Design a protein around this ligand. Structure first.
Ligand SMILES: Cc1c(F)cccc1Cc1c(C(=O)N2CCNCC2)c2c(C)c(O)ccc2n1-c1ccccc1
Ligand SMILES: *[C@@H]1O[C@H](CO)[C@@H](O)[C@H](O)[C@H]1NC(C)=O
Length: 337
């Protein structure tokens, strides 16, 4: 094809980057996360019981008001690291930044308050492969590819650092290419181990001088939907000990005064070193000794086949403009701007 389509994203507190999609005729609009760590499209359904408070706060899809709706009704359960959703399959017309696709998506009827009440987004757009799609439903990007409209069989992610300003731009996804306005230098491509998962080989994690972890290799899933960089509980508990961070219920803290003194964290990928400074991974809300600052790193035990793995989420993507190459089954990284 000849076309490139861009989706503008909203940056919510550096943890959620969401765009807009339209479903049905006339379009019903939803705030969605474009997730490379999953392959299914879902939105909350009007058929969701209002005893799920998450369904009371989010925008619901009503099939009754869509003229393009095609019923299916097959049940589906989508299990994620942070929680689970259930619903049934439905078919309709989806609009993603100028591209219109006939897509099979989940109408969510069971949506727990934890974590979904914390979500600013209503639904999810899975950017993974059909190999990871629950119910073997064709993912949205495969359907866009089938239209033969895109210049390249690629998609890119730009996540902005700045969240507290307007006119700034929260982020951007480019379908069919990369925006050279948002990166500098050249892409360094790392090939995927196998097709089916946006996962690459990682050959070490360095805290300061020493390569404290992942010597003899480990895995790294490049997940656009993950707020933070994650590792296994054992890798994390070890990394956090090295930094001097204190384990809480869910997230790790450090004394705000100690934040800028923290050592650099480096990730060995495709023979290159991808380094994060303490400015990149500490939520530096203050410098007070009497205050605690959160780190944009946490533990996540991802079960097999995918895991155990590290996950390079928004924390990593903010520093490195990421290109997802479906044609050559590789991931490209470049310094973001
Ligand atoms: C963001 C997201 C998604 F895109 C698809 C499915 C589930 C989630 C929820 C969700 C996460 C999640 O389970 N996944 C798995 C599939 N790929 C995306 C990340 C998640 C992860 C793993 C984190 O390390 C940190 C926050 C997370 N949020 C989260 C963020 C903000 C508020 C509440 C939760
Ligand atoms: C739902 O869609 C799938 C497409 O893979 C089809 O094989 C199945 O029979 C459908 N069920 C209904 C009730 O339309």
């Amino acid at each position: 094809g000849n076309t490139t389509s861009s989706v503008i994203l909203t940056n919510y507190m550096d943890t959620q980057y969401y765009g807009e999609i339209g479903i049905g005729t006339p379009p019903q609009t939803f705030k969605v996360v474009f997730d490379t760590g999953s392959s299914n499209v879902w939105v909350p359904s009007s058929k969701c019981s209002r005893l799920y408070t998450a369904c009371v706060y989010h925008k619901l899809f009503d099939a009754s008001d869509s003229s393009s709706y095609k019923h299916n009704g097959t049940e589906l359960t989508l299990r994620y690291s942070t929680g689970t959703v259930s619903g049934f399959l439905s078919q309709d017309i989806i609009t993603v930044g100028g591209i219109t696709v006939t897509q099979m998506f989940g109408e969510v009827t069971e949506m727990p308050a934890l974590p979904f009440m914390l979500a600013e987004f209503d639904g999810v757009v899975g950017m993974g492969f059909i190999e990871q799609a629950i119910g073997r439903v064709t993912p949205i990007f495969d359907n866009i590819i089938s239209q033969g409209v895109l210049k390249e069989d690629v998609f890119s992610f730009y996540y902005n650092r700045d969240s507290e300003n307007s006119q700034s731009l929260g982020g951007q996804i480019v379908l069919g290419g990369s925006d050279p306005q948002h990166y500098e230098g050249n892409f360094h491509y790392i090939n995927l181990i196998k097709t089916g998962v946006w996962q690459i080989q990682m050959k070490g994690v360095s805290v300061g001088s020493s390569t404290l972890l992942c010597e003899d290799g480990c895995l790294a899933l490049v997940d656009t939907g993950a707020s933070y960089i994650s590792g296994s509980t054992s890798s994390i508990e070890k990394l956090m000990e090295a930094l001097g961070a204190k384990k809480r219920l869910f997230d790790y803290v450090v004394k705000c005064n100690e934040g800028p003194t923290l050592p650099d964290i480096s990730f060995h990928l495709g023979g290159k070193e991808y380094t994060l400074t303490s400015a990149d991974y500490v939520f530096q809300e203050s410098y007070s000794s009497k205050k605690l600052c959160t780190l944009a790193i946490h533990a996540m035990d991802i079960p097999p086949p995918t895991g155990p793995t590290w996950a390079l989420g928004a924390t990593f993507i903010r520093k490195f403009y990421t290109e997802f190459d479906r044609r050559n089954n590789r991931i490209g990284f470049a310094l973001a701007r």
